[PDB]
Amino acid sequence: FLKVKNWETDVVLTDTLHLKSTLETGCTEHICMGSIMLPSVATKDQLFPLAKEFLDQYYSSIKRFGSKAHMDRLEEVNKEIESTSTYQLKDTELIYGAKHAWRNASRCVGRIQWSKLQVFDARDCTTAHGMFNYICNHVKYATNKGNLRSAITIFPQRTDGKHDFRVWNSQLIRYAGYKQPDGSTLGDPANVQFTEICIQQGWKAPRGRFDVLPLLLQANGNDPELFQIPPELVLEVPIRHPKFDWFKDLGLKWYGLPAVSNMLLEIGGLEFSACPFSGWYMGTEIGVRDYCDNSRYNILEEVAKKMDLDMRKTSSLWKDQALVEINIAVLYSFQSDKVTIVDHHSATESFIKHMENEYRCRGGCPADWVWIVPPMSGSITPVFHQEMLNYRLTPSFEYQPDPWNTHVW
Ligand code: HEM
Ligand SMILES: CNCCc1cc(F)c(F)c(-c2cc(C)cc(N)n2)c1
Ligand SMILES: C[C@H](O)[C@H](O)[C@H]1CNc2nc(N)[nH]c(=O)c2N1
Ligand SMILES: [Zn+2]
């Protein structure tokens, strides 16, 4: 029953939820892995404990723990794991599972919204064309004319392992990356291997900067197939600044919809290898990481120039200065277009408030400080001063290998 303190407000919360934690962290009594980025076929023996554990908490959630329906659904799933060495979630259990996978995502600062999640059941999907259609409806719904809405589309669960449904894209909407004949990079350098894979599968690249990549969709473990998201469904925000009119000349833009498509959704021991989920952006994801990472668009160089800054001396903080302007611009541009976005101040404040709610009516809130604290201005946001216990609850979103390494073509 551990205590977590906030050192800006002196507020203490007692965490008991970590007792329900099952998985492991990577840390031991003698080493802390809290800054390691990635911390690391299922049988029927292992499957019923996970099913039972999940069904227990689901039925405890609808205020019917131990009722007759709980007992029968338990025996129903036990018997289905006998006959088929797997089982199928009810629609309701799927929606519960998915919302709590988000709820339990310790690295997500946006979880105050976790109960407002739109779950699209795509478990009847059979082909990549079907996936494409399901993803298009996801994009359109989640974008909602810029009034973004949280959503997840859940494709058939893994069965044997060689019939996985996979979205090969790391996110549904990402810009292309092209290495250049002079060794530099165009577009997004993070996607240069993926952009070449699309080209190997036949993508005709408009070798420019902000080229929306096509979907690479693998259905039932079959080879994956290319589809272009109808561009009218890809909402983009041209980035302008409220003071610097030359900022439009940068010609920057970003897409409104952050939609992670490479993670694995675990519910009651069932594994959903394709489960694209989307919300809305926190400003810093674009302004700081996408734009100013050295291995991403890396625009601190150009933006500092146009600001009339001292780029000779490291200690002039020209980088810090141009980083703020960039993030004022990302926010202003999204807001002026009525496209949902949250600033790292409002997002972190809501997460503290979210944390307070979880400690009250749930006994805790697993949280990964290394990821919750924004990548600029860390200590002028309240999460910097908030001790956080990280632990792995299930249902959960898990990392999984990139499919081009595991697939058998
Ligand atoms: C609703 C608005 C949301 C906001 C503002 C938000 C914010 C964020 C941010 C800033 C990150 C860190 C991303 C990065 O640094 O790369 C993150 C990570 C994450 N988000 Fe949220 N998110 C939202 C919605 C969602 C939804 C709907 C889901 C799932 C149903 C989700 C699940 C996750 C997960 C699992 C991670 C961790 C990814 C990883 O470990 O690589 N989020 N979120
Ligand atoms: C494989 N791990 C990916 C981590 C990641 C990368 C990324 F580029 C994102 F945009 C989001 C992300 C996701 C959601 C749902 C909301 C939000 N604000 N960000 C998360
Ligand atoms: C080394 C470190 O774990 C790695 O750079 C992490 C740090 N914290 C992060 N935090 C968020 N939100 N997103 C990230 O990609 C990372 N990267
Ligand atoms: Zn640790």
DSSP secondary structure of 211-277: PBPPEEEE-TTPPPEEEPPPGGGS-EEE---SS-GGGGGG--EEES--EE-S-EEEETTEEES---E
Ligand 3 mean position, distance from CA 399 (Å) = 14
Amino acid type, 95: I
Alpha helix stretches (DSSP H) within 21-174: 44-61, 68-84, 91-103, 128-143
CA distances from 8 to 108, 256, 359, 379, 384 (A): 21, 33, 18, 10, 9
Mind listing the domains of the chain with CATH numbers?
Answer: 15-123+150-160+264-278+348-372 (3.90.340.10), 124-149+164-235+399-403 (3.90.440.10), 236-258+281-346 (3.90.1230.10)
- The number of the ligand nearest the C-alpha atom of 290 reads 2
Nearest to 285 by CA among 301, 296, 274: 296
- The protein residue whose alpha carbon is closest to atom 3 in ligand 2 is 260
Q: Tell me whether the omega of the peptide bond preceding residue 403 falls within 30 degrees of 0, making it cis.
A: no
- The protein residue whose alpha carbon is closest to atom 5 in ligand 1 is 110
CA distances from 161 to 44, 156, 165, 221, 402 (A): 14, 12, 10, 8, 14
Ligand 1 mean position, distance from CA 260 (Å) = 8
> Residue 171 annotated as binding?
yes
Tell me the two tokens of residue 307: 């600001």
> Residue 285 annotated as binding?
yes
> Residue 371 annotated as binding?
yes
Please work out whether the CB of residue 370 comes within 6 Å of at least one atom of ligand 3. Answer: yes
Ligand 3 atom closest to the CA of 372, numbered from 1:
12
Q: Which residues are catalytic?
A: 108, 111, 280, 285
Helix 68-84 to helix 44-61 angle (10° resolution) is 160
User: Measured between alpha carbons, how far is 155 from 278 in angstroms, rounded to an integer?
Assistant: 15
Q: What is the resolution of this structure in A?
A: 1.9
3-state secondary structure of 175: strand
The method recorded for this entry reads: X-ray
Tell me the two tokens of residue 117: 């999640």
Strand 281-282, strand 341-342: pairing: parallel
Give 296's DSSP letter. T
> Residue 59 annotated as binding?
no
End-to-end CA distance of the chain: 50
User: Measured between alpha carbons, how far is 131 from 154 in angstroms, rounded to an integer?
Assistant: 10
- The protein residue whose alpha carbon is closest to atom 18 in ligand 2 is 281
> Looking only at Cα atoms, what is the longest distance across the chain?
73
- The protein residue whose alpha carbon is closest to atom 20 in ligand 2 is 260
Alpha helix stretches (DSSP H) within 62-191: 68-84, 91-103, 128-143
Nearest to 281 by CA among 188, 173, 138: 173
- Helix (H) or strand (E) run with residue 121 in it: strand 118-121
Please work out whether the CB of residue 107 comes within 6 Å of at least one atom of ligand 2. Answer: no
Ligand 2 mean position, distance from CA 202 (Å) = 27
3-state secondary structure of 178: strand
Nearest to 303 by CA among 247, 376, 377: 247
- The protein residue whose alpha carbon is closest to atom 1 in ligand 3 is 35
- The number of the ligand nearest the C-alpha atom of 256 reads 2
Half-sphere exposure at residue 208, Cβ-oriented, CA atoms within 13 angstroms: 8
3-state secondary structure of 354: helix
Please work out whether the CB of residue 35 comes within 6 Å of at least one atom of ligand 3. Answer: yes
Tell me the two tokens of residue 208: 């420019």
Question: What are the phi and psi torsion angles at 282 (to 5°)?
Answer: -80, 135
- The number of the ligand nearest the C-alpha atom of 34 reads 4
Please work out whether the CB of residue 295 comes within 6 Å of at least one atom of ligand 3. Answer: no
